[PDB]
Amino acid sequence: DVAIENNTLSRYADAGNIDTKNNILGSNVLKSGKTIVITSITGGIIEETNYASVYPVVEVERGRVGACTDEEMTISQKLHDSILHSRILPKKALKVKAGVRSANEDGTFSVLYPDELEDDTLKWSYVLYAKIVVLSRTGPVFDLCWNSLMYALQSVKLPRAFIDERASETYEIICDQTKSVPLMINAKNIAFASNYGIVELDPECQLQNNTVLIADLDTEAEETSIHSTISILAAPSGNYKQLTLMGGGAKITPEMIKRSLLLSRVRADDLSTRFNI
Amino acid sequence: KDIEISASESKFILEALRQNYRLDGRSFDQFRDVEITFGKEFGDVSVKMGNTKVHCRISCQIAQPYEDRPFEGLFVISTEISPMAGSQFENGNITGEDEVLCSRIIEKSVRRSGALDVEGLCIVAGSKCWAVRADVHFLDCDGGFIDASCI
Amino acid sequence: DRRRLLGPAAAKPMAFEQELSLHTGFIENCNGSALVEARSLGHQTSLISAVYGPRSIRGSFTSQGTISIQLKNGLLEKYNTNELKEVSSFLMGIFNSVVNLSRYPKSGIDIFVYLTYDKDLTNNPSQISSLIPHCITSITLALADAGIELVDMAGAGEANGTVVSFIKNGEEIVGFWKDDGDDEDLLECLDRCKEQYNRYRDLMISCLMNQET
Amino acid sequence: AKRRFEYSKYRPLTPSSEVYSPIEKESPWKILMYQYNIPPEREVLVREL
Amino acid sequence: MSRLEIYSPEGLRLDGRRWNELRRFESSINTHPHAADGSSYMEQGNNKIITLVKGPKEPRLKSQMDTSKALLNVSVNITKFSKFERSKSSHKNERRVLEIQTSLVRMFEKNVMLNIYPRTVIDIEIHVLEQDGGIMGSLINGITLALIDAGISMFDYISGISVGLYDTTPLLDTNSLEENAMSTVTLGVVGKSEKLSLLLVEDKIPLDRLENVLAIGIAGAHRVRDLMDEELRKHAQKRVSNAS
Amino acid sequence: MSVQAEIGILDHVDGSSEFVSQDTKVICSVTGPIEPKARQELPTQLALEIIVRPAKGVATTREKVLEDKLRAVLTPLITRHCYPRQLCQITCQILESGEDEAEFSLRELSCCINAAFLALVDAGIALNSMCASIPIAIIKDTSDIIVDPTAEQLKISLSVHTLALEFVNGGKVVKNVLLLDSNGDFNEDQLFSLLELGEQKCQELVTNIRRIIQDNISPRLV
Amino acid sequence: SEVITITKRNGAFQNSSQIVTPGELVTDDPIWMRGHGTYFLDNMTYSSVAGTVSRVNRLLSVIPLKGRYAPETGDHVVGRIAEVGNKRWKVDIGGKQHAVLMLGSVNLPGGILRRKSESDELQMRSFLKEGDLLNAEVQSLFQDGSASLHTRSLKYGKLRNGMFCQVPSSLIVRAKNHTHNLPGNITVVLGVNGYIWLRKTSQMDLARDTSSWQIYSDENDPSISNNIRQAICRYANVIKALAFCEIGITQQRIVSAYEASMVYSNVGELIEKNVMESIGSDILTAEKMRG
Amino acid sequence: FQFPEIAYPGKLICPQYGTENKDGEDIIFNYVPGPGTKLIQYEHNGRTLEAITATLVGTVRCEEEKRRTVKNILVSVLPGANNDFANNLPKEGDIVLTRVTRLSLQRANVEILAVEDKPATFSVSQASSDLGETFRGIIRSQDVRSTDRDRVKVIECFKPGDIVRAQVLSLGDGTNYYLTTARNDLGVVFARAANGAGGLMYATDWQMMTSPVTGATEKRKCAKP
Amino acid sequence: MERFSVLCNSNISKSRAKPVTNSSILLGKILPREEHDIAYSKDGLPNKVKTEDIRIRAQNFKSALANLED
Amino acid sequence: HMSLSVAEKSYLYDSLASTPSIRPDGRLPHQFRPIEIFTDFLPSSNGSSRIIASDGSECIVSIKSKVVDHHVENELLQVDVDIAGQRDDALVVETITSLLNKVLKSGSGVDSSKLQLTKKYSFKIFVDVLVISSHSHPISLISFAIYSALNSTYLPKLISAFDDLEVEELPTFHDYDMVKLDINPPLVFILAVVGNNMLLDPAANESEVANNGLIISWSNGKITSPIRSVALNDSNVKSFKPHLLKQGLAMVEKYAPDVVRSLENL
């Protein structure tokens, strides 16, 4: 079962009272079973002189100090590669529409921005930094991190930027502490994660008065002994973003791939429904 | 990991050097012939000295120069060793005695010496500069790594 | 960086009634865990404490246990790493009196405290001091939940930047943290934090009874 | 060349090389008691022999 | 804003010295008795170096232990306040520094038999308090003095020197300005011999110059070696007088 | 499918190879079985140290994924229980991408799988079976399934695929699918048409591979 | 200087028979046998260290001015256990290497009555534990020069009922005995290695001048008077004072300094430099006019 | 009834000593600390005092264990799925399930997984097997079997990965515990053919282990059900 | 013991059996949440399971693994 | 740092925990050990000091200056702590670094007015600490050295006008001439708690057996923050009665001026 809490850690959590200190653009808390996932989205302003992605920093807590494990390295890249290849975030959606700030001599403070100019252009660009914390891990956790990141990306607000008259001394370019616009991403490309496994069990079963497949791998027992696995990122439109297959313990029949596609599609329907409500 | 050499080898090679002889049948002042092969792309070069095989790849990308040097571009040389050249080398061991020496020899021979015109790597002063990178790949080892790398 | 994905290095970051909620034993990855949420006025703090141990150290000849505490930034990057180490050193100076070390020879207890969030509202025409009593509350709960023997319940309070931790029903002190604020608040802060201690203590004891039940 | 011979029994065990003793003397009966694994009840007998 | 030259027609340099003058040398033994087995405080010009020799002693990890020879370690701490302009970052991991540390080790591995202290470790800690040219040569002299103070056996002295070259003639013992102005050669000299433990050239140097530059350095290093013997012997005489 | 490979090119390694498909050139080396580090030791099985080096720049998280997928293929191939408490170092140095590395890593992964297998063969390490990997892509308008696509074809692709199968019985029986890495979106009819034509060209490749192996190695034997 | 004595100095980092120099030649007589501190090439004999030339018979050597203490066979040393491994301890003595001990080189509680057990080698930590101090005699020497210790005596064993302090090993020489009884009912143990143990005088010491189950107990004497404790502190300070003046520590020197230090009311007055220097100076001059 | 049934960590239960009046004679109740309790020192008004204090949150249970009478009461605290069980630690005489990590010629080292309780039930020691934090133990060649203690072929007794039920003679050093499979109920319990590559094998003879699946037979040291 | 009474008694009295109010601002509801499961029927619609029922699945397996020897 | 046996530690506790407390040395509960201080030996820096303890503990402090815009540079005094042969990252290093920076904040225990040059520019002070050797908590050792260094520091003198809002002249400094940095550096005292006794300047062996410890700052003739309780060791740490805390503050409050008086000599 999956239960989430979106926009709880963001600065845009409350409409009336906005956090002046918090720099989180979008957030998501997720817990599937025992494993808990906490995603926070931050940003940056970059000058610019087809689709892009975000830069995730996953921290899986196992209770050991030291550098980043090979797990955290691969996941950070796998999240970055999948988003980049699933075409979720276009480079045009990250374009910064700036503005101007003209100040009266204590008479007034004026800020002006134009919608029309940006459409004509159709130029600072936004960059989305992500950090994903994982608590209480119990198995393959890439899917959990992906789903939490997807829900977090569904709700991201990009604050507008502007500069008070300045000369190319030191000049500080600033964003607005209030005004912001919602991030526009392709919902048609939005996918969700799920894992599957293939194994054979010898043991006989008693009776009282041919391959088998397991969905959503958890527990050490399944992660350790099941060497034939399938990973899917599926979309509600029914377009599929990616597919991970590796058989190391048993043969992978085409009939099992089809079930996974059906299983993955069903998961996408379930996840999609949750987002709507 | 420490390589094992027989006492018999250590006595044989040492005695052979006193008789002006060596295993690969060379002289004392002789340098093994160097073979240079260029790839399809520019900056792709393969240097071979006997069994010693090294490969270098030159690349560059638009970057911004340091505040201290607004007229100079960026230039770095990478020589990370790998177990491919032999199991004697630890993967990513960039602090070992021989590794740091080799890294410093190349740097003082190319970087510090100003073999490359870093001033000509500047596009717009204090704003945009080219960043040339020299990546050396030690494919296999039969000695002479420093000589192979400089070439 | 070849370890993580820091993105473009030529870019720049963004430039612009006491209430308690206690929950323990919600993490199956460690031996003991705790969740502490406090909301006062416009200021609220939520942190998670994870305990791993006691686990045997090979070759260790120590006749007692060894405690290690580390604070982490869960979301908002506010507190300096240098300051996090300072509090950690302060926290370990407290629980080394609280934890019965004689029970775990040749062993070590690692304590991870994740400061996932703190929300600060400041009006316009120290800082980490207020979080300290909540960190002590979280750890003492996580240790007691883990099964680690504690000589007494550790608790604290924050009064005008002056933090002081109590055990044995406020009769003695296991930690003292004073930054800035004002002088001659010695007697006052000791009395105000003692009330916060007793309040935090009973809720901590009730917490274990509830979840344990 | 220096070392001097003396009867073994009188001297307390000595670290120094110069002192020489024909036999070690702490538990001569007992040393050999360990070897044949002789019980301490027979110990009195063993010492006499 | 200013400008400056190197060598004037009057035979004078930017600091006032002539072509062949050693800077002020002060040497100091047994400066940190309660911190190390051997210690030396070096003052060669404005250069200020603390050198500590800790050992031979038990290794902290049995994994790193040689049963045939002692383990020799050297760590150079170039402080952030060594120069006029304080460096923001630490210099410890810097590839330039790793090469220096490596270089120094290679030098003294052949100068101490290091066969008479098996299953031990010799740790050499160095702190550079102030820097003003020829820091490598000063590092060499500091280690040699400190090692001797520790009563650690070695075959001979190793004296370090700095060489500055302009036009036809090199300048002995270069400071930072001269080092900035012209290429320098750092020489490691063993005892009173002509044998070099360390030959270090990091900038461009005409090939004609080196033979003569080496000749100047070796002669100057001999003077430095003589001074060091005087420095320790003189101290001993002074210490004996103090005792009396 | 006009690939070209050489075996035993490195001197200071137990086994090595150089696989080339189109532009994509990868050189691989294998040392083992040898003494493992304590943190690498496996009580009963062989420990694999897998390293992937990029053609340009240093190894990043990208190559960390190439190492992971390459691990999924090589692990079940090797009879690991023959070497308990032992290590096998496997290093891949990609010499030429043969593709836009900023967008794809398809051809580099397949070439690494084929090269690693060849290096394992050269090193004389116990293998349960044989293996071959090919890159596949799908066109934007034509939607055709192109096996071994060029770099230019990848630019205009809708999906990219890495397929590595496990073969037994003289390279005629597909024991299992070691790795299938599909990025993009799919239709069922295209997939099986791809698998049918793909199996044919793979079988032709093994036959060619067998020829190459015999021709080079036979002069060495007696 | 009522609370703290702070000596200050400005503009300076710090304050203040043939001659021997490096590269120096000692002799050119090839008949000589070259010893420590020297090295040779044909007829020439050179010095390897800074020190004084020593000629004993035909053996030419150079005695260094400084260096590590060296273990001679039969020395009475005091050491603190560094590590416990296998069937031995490695005990810090203060040399180049840790002291070596063999389970068969120590004496078990109950002794002769006691029977050999194979569980002793697995329970060595119940006898000697890291940090413990003890008396020991250098039984033998290893090839490199390391020492093998033994405590096969009532005289040797675990130390208690006192306090530890150390002086440079050069200030303590070999003697007939290193355990001494002093006024104030305290006993000193002057290890040749420079490690010194000051404790309350036990019955053992008294017997010499004229329970085997608790020879490894960490417990001290439950009844130790303040007068003994304040005596230990005083003996400690005067020993440090003798060490500060490079004065060789002997039993006569210690007691002499202890009684001479009685001039100063508070014991803490003995930690100041001028007090230490004068106390040592008074001892040398006392030996002058008495000699 | 005098002492609270359930005590949280830090709650006072009962003083050091106790006594009551019955049958015209004083009965002395001696309170001794147990699992979950810790005898500590508390002073009030300048007065020193020792009392039994619980260290774990649990219900409290007492049990008697051993002219003028004489008594001894054991005071302890029991918690009250997830199981931790730290108090449980390998001690001389206990039975322990282990797994073979490596085989040498003169001995066989393993790692401790679970420990048998006392009246079957076991106490599982949770630790990371890919780190080395797990307790390691060593089974000597002389401790393999009582039959022919001198010459024993270790290859024909144990095998890497095989599960071995043994009894610990002594703690040994920090590295290795001492393990003996001399008796009948001790030996290889669970094992597979070819170091775990084949199928499951079962114990028939004490010195022979067979597999009723592939018909494979490997020589092991088997125990008795 | 009487000293115990005055101090012990005083200590016992102080707590006052004060009432406790339960709330979670954000994290508390989601983190301590026990494990849950759902099943997708042929309709494709998710289906919930009773908490008691889920446990029953656990206790039934334990009896079928222990007692039901073959 | 120091390693002691169980027997030695108990004896030390008996010696020091006694009602008439006796130092193993023989000191009184307020007596410091003799120290030596050197100043003005680094000409390259604006100020410098070197403190030597009786146990060989040695610390070197350097003071360097830099002109900064105080409108963008919040902290005008940065303390940096280091130890050769020691990693920078270590818990002890960062804690002391964080602590010292609070002790010498711009608007807490330091007259930052004396660092101001113009309306827009001020002097940033870099206090670099180098601990060569130490056998106990070096916080008080470093504090004495920083004090001595800051009281012998000389900064460049400004020439140009001090109104950047209007005329906006580039900051220029007259050659040769310099102005002594008039400032009041705070001191950091460390205490040891053994039983019910409080000791000033805890020795190594004393700290090992101590039940607890206190870090109390001192400025302008009064107690000031940061005030921190600290575990000198980790094997014998116990809670302490509040009266001990008040005793410690009182103890510092009466013996500090004596220390400052012996330290204020130019």
Curated annotation (Swiss-Prot), chain A:
Gene3D superfamilies given in the database record: GHMP Kinase, N-terminal domain
Tree of life domain: Eukaryota
Entry-linked Pfam families: RNase_PH
InterPro entries: ExoRNase_PH_dom1, Exosome_comp_Rrp42_subfam, PNPase/RNase_PH_dom_sf, Ribosomal_Su5_D2-typ_SF
GO cellular component terms listed in the entry, alphabetical order: cytoplasm; cytoplasmic exosome (RNase complex); exosome (RNase complex); nuclear exosome (RNase complex); nucleolus; nucleoplasm; nucleus
GO molecular function, one term: mRNA 3'-UTR AU-rich region binding
Chief location of this protein within or outside the cell: cytoplasm
Disulfide bonds: none
Location relative to the cell: Cytoplasm; Nucleus, Nucleolus
BP terms from Gene Ontology: exonucleolytic trimming to generate mature 3'-end of 5.8S rRNA from tricistronic rRNA transcript (SSU-rRNA, 5.8S rRNA, LSU-rRNA); mRNA catabolic process; mRNA processing; nuclear mRNA surveillance; nuclear polyadenylation-dependent mRNA catabolic process; nuclear polyadenylation-dependent rRNA catabolic process; nuclear-transcribed mRNA catabolic process; RNA catabolic process
Record keywords: Acetylation, Cytoplasm, Exosome, Nucleus, Phosphoprotein, RNA-binding, rRNA processing
Note from the entry: Present with 3180 molecules/cell in log phase SD medium.
Family per record: Belongs to the RNase PH family.
Protein name listed in UniProt: Exosome complex component RRP43
Organism, as annotated: Saccharomyces cerevisiae (strain ATCC 204508 / S288c)
This protein's encoding gene: RRP43
Swiss-Prot record, chain G:
One Pfam family from the record: RRP4_S1
Modified residues (N-acetylserine): 1
Effect of residue 101 to P: In RRP4-1; temperature-sensitive(ts) lethal mutation
Compartments in which it is found: Cytoplasm; Nucleus, Nucleolus
One Gene Ontology MF term: RNA binding
GO CC, alphabetical: cytoplasmic exosome (RNase complex); exosome (RNase complex); nuclear exosome (RNase complex); nucleolus; nucleus
S1 motif domain mapped to chain residues: 72-152
Claim: Translocase is one of the keywords in the record: no
Keywords annotated in UniProt: Acetylation, Cytoplasm, Exosome, Nucleus, Phosphoprotein, RNA-binding, rRNA processing
Main location per the UniProt record: cytoplasm
Single biological process term from Gene Ontology: nuclear mRNA surveillance
Family: Belongs to the RRP4 family.
Note: Present with 4840 molecules/cell in log phase SD medium.
Stated role: Non-catalytic component of the RNA exosome complex which has 3'->5' exoribonuclease activity and participates in a multitude of cellular RNA processing and degradation events. In the nucleus, the RNA exosome complex is involved in proper maturation of stable RNA species such as rRNA, snRNA and snoRNA, in the elimination of RNA processing by-products and non-coding 'pervasive' transcripts, such as antisense RNA species and cryptic unstable transcripts (CUTs), and of mRNAs with processing defects, thereby limiting or excluding their export to the cytoplasm.
PANTHER family named in the record: EXOSOME COMPLEX COMPONENT RRP4 (PTHR21321:SF4), PNAS-3 RELATED (PTHR21321)
Designated name of the protein: Exosome complex component RRP4
Organism of origin: Saccharomyces cerevisiae (strain ATCC 204508 / S288c) (Baker's yeast)
Gene name, Swiss-Prot/TrEMBL: RRP4
Curated annotation (Swiss-Prot), chain H:
Something else known: Present with 5550 molecules/cell in log phase SD medium.
PANTHER family named among the record's database cross-references: 3'-5' EXORIBONUCLEASE CSL4-RELATED (PTHR12686), EXOSOME COMPLEX COMPONENT CSL4 (PTHR12686:SF8)
Transmembrane segments: none
Protein encoded by which gene: CSL4
Subcellular locations according to the entry: Cytoplasm; Nucleus, Nucleolus
Protein name: Exosome complex component CSL4
Top-level division of the source organism's lineage: Eukaryota
Molecular function as annotated in GO: RNA binding
Curated annotation (Swiss-Prot), chain I:
Effect of disrupting the coding gene: Deletion mutant is temperature-sensitive. Impaired growth at 37 degrees Celsius. Impaired growth at all temperatures, nonviable at 37 degrees Celsius. Mutant is defective in the 3' processing of the 5.8S rRNA and accumulates a discrete species, 5.8S + 30, that is 3' extended by 30 nucleotides. Accumulates 7S RNA. Accumulates 5' external transcribed spacer (ETS) RNA. Accumulates extended forms of snR40 small nucleolar RNA (snoRNA). Accumulates U24 + 3 snoRNA. Accumulates poly(A)+ snoRNAs.
Coiled-coil regions listed in the entry: none
Protein location: Nucleus, Nucleolus; Nucleus
More details: Present with 2160 molecules/cell in log phase SD medium.
Family (UniProt): Belongs to the exosome component 10/RRP6 family.
Function: Nuclear-specific catalytic component of the RNA exosome complex which has 3'->5' exoribonuclease activity and participates in a multitude of cellular RNA processing and degradation events. In the nucleus, the RNA exosome complex is involved in proper maturation of stable RNA species such as rRNA, snRNA and snoRNA, in the elimination of RNA processing by-products and non-coding 'pervasive' transcripts, such as antisense RNA species and cryptic unstable transcripts (CUTs), and of mRNAs with processing defects, thereby limiting or excluding their export to the cytoplasm.
Protein's recorded name: Exosome complex exonuclease RRP6
